[PDB]
């Protein structure tokens, strides 16, 4: 059973790697907007948590 579960573990590992790469790529792009919205446009007017 532990061997059988380790195969599930490895599937999860590959999935996790893919998701990791995608998340990092998103952050890299979003950084530019953050540097650009330092004009005090983000604090409440743009970031409407509602």
């Amino acid at each position: 059973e532990m061997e059988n579960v380790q195969k599930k573990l490895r599937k999860l590992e590959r999935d996790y790697y893919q998701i990791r790469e995608q998340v990092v790529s998103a952050k890299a792009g979003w950084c530019a907007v953050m540097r650009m919205v330092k004009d005090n446009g983000v604090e409440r007017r743009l970031h409407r948590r509602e």
Binding site: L9, L12, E13, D15, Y16, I19, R20, Q22, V23, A26, K27, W30, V33, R45, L46, H47, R48
Partner: protein
């Protein structure tokens, strides 16, 4: 005097409300996609470690 100021306020208000509606929506869309993929990655990370 009223007839002047009333008009000016109408124009200010309409522009501000529509512009914020137009921009904030997509800004939050992006933030939410990034949040979602990060959350999925963290759940996968924790489950893999355990």
């Amino acid at each position: 005097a009223i007839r002047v100021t009333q008009s000016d306020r109408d124009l200010f208000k309409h522009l501000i409300t529509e512009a914020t509606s137009y921009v904030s929506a997509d800004y939050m869309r992006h933030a939410n996609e990034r949040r979602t993929h990060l959350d999925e990655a963290l759940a996968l990370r924790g489950e893999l470690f355990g």
